[PDB]
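Standup notes
- HV: blocked on the assembly model, inputs below
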Amino acid sequence: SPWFGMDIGGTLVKLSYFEPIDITAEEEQEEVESLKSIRKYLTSNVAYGSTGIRDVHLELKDLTLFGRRGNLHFIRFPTQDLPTFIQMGRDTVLCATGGGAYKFEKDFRTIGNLHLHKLDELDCLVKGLLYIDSVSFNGQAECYYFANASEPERCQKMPFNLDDPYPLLVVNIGSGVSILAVHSKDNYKRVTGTSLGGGTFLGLCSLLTGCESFEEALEMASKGDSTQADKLVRDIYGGDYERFGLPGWAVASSFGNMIYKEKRESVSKEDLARATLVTITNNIGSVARMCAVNEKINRVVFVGNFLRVNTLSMKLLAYALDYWSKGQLKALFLEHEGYFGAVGALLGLPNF
Amino acid sequence: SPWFGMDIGGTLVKLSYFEPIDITAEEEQEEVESLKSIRKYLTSNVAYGSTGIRDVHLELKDLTLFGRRGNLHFIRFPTQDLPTFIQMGRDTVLCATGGGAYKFEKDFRTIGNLHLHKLDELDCLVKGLLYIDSVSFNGQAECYYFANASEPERCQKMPFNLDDPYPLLVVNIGSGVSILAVHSKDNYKRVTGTSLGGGTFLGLCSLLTGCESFEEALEMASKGDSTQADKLVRDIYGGDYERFGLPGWAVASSFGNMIYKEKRESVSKEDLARATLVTITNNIGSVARMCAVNEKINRVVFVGNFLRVNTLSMKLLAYALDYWSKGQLKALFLEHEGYFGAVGALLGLPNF
Ligand SMILES: Nc1ncnc2c1ncn2[C@@H]1O[C@H](COP(=O)(O)OP(=O)(O)NP(=O)(O)O)[C@@H](O)[C@H]1O
Ligand SMILES: Nc1ncnc2c1ncn2[C@@H]1O[C@H](COP(=O)(O)OP(=O)(O)NP(=O)(O)O)[C@@H](O)[C@H]1O
Ligand SMILES: N#Cc1ccc(N2CCN(C(=O)Cc3ccc(C4CC4)cc3)CC2)nn1
Ligand SMILES: N#Cc1ccc(N2CCN(C(=O)Cc3ccc(C4CC4)cc3)CC2)nn1
Ligand SMILES: [Mg+2]
Ligand SMILES: [Mg+2]
């Protein structure tokens, strides 16, 4: 059987695939044709069908896993297209996590003799995150932060060492947000969550702007000015609110200037997209800050695909977490941020 | 001079007016005609102009204040109409709080010889809240909670005693949200705030539904089904997420079902209004919960005008705070919830 791990989320399916590269002459002979066809299909294409994508830049090359050498591949497609995936499969042991491992369990069992092993979506996350950081990103750091995030002329991506990763607050921004406190490799809990996550960004953006994709929403947001929609502290006070150290630029009311009909009539789609992004990103940062203070954890790592190709939100989180915590908290990011559940599921294979 | 206190917020101006009722025969003679005209104007009308309203049901009758007996009146109008108010005044000591006491300071000084005394918006809140609870609501409790908030056949408003009110978490839901921790009558701090408040509800509702007022937004929300817009835990898992005690009905992603074009095309305005209300209310509850746990405070009182004529949000807060805290936190409400800053400002009059 090929070695897969799958994370079926509310929005995206993430698949980690281990491609062996130490196949001997004898092993090749015993390779059944359906299996050779899968390996060739996966390694010679970067787009699969109309909606599947291999993230080639994330490939881990010449990894030793389960006593074999191979390449670790990272693939994603929309959960809405899981029926296509399962139909391809009907034309072997699957370790699966995410809510969809439960929701679609009966559908995976339509593949004859398939053994589905459901693994918990946050257990897999912790195991996958720790594993990828430990093996490194082809010799480079898996984890990074934004140095001098408050000064745009200085702000830059820099590596961060996690060789002793505990304790760690993990903020998983998917459709919603789960917040985990990780005290050791076997001692972690889900602190809380928030419903204002990546699905809120995408869903509200689509309602407000008519954008047709995540990438289009980000494109619009990059051109917009959120202060056309948001009411700032300076809109209420005329300046800073000095008594409580609130700068005039801080958002007092997200979308709060949209209570005025004339402002609704002048605001652009791009402004609304940027206000949606800023509202969601600041709320995630603030909740993370409150949880870090309560858990007595000062390293906060953000994962999940809300942040893929989303440097705006990453830089906003880096700045906001640093600013509003007075430098006590540090925002961390991971190169493989959307795939840790899929990797953790793959790592469960030896238990079956 | 008449005895006023004013709280000029980002959205509403709140005015507390003390009407003396122990005017002697001699005092009446010395009553200057402009002053008699103000008192008659205020006490014989319940609507002022097109946008001012006296909340007659909140009047405190036969209150002793500053050694005189009188009635305490509660009046509100939109901050957008403050120019009309100031123009009426130009056709005496004003204790004023809220951001507008700073933003509009120069405008109040266009009233000749007027003395404007700016007081801090959260200091006034604490003083006004403690004062009104102490004098009672015409012999009835100022503070109330929802008994058995989880069972709709039982859920009912019941009085709550605050004779020893400390400590107290005060959640002020105006345009945005300020969270205060009150340890004594002179020891209180602003813990944090969130930008997702009443202005977010009203602004997003107006963008999404075309509603023209707060009351219309609430009317639409009362008819809607937020689960048409929100992605629930059961939409992702097919049921409860048992491992972490998440019920299937919990919202996993606010507006998360609006990433699907066909769902955007079937959702009603009423559904969107209700989803906006639920999203904002749950976020306020969750932030309050996290702050209460960090501050080691188990009584959480919600104030501000987001909750005026808004039993939906009050009941949602009562249920959610109780459910998600496993009964450790209690949601409290106050009959005069939008006016405490205005009262606290009035109480500053003897210092000038
Ligand atoms: N191609 C894409 N399509 C859709 N959403 C995308 C895409 N790229 C990034 N996103 C964002 O990524 C989020 C989904 O992140 P992801 O971590 O994959 O969540 P999920 O696992 O599917 N959901 P959950 O069940 O809550 O864990 C979306 O809500 C978007 O904000
Ligand atoms: N008649 C109304 N007009 C507008 N908003 C209303 C009205 N009635 C209730 N609201 C709600 O009440 C909120 C304003 O509450 P309020 O406590 O008066 O805030 P504010 O003091 O003006 N703002 P802030 O400067 O942030 O303290 C609005 O955002 C609405 O959600
Ligand atoms: N990472 C991270 C992170 C990101 C944001 C964040 N904020 C906490 C602080 N804040 C507020 O208080 C908002 C607010 C200001 C004024 C008022 C009213 C007095 C007029 C109400 C509400 C903004 C959000 N905290 N942490
Ligand atoms: N008062 C008050 C109050 C109100 C709400 C509240 N919630 C905290 C708990 N919660 C979540 O975790 C949301 C969520 C669920 C699942 C997932 C993903 C696994 C698929 C992500 C996110 C809902 C909001 N807490 N307190
Ligand atoms: Mg996920
Ligand atoms: Mg206010």
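- HV (later): unblocked. The pocket of ODG (ligand 3) is lined by residues A 233, 236, 241, 246, 250-252, 282, 285-286, 289, 320-321, 324; B 99, 176-178, 192-193, 195 (CB under 6 Å). Chain A has three domains: 1-140+339-352, 141-224+268-338, 225-267.
- Next: hand off to the docking folks.
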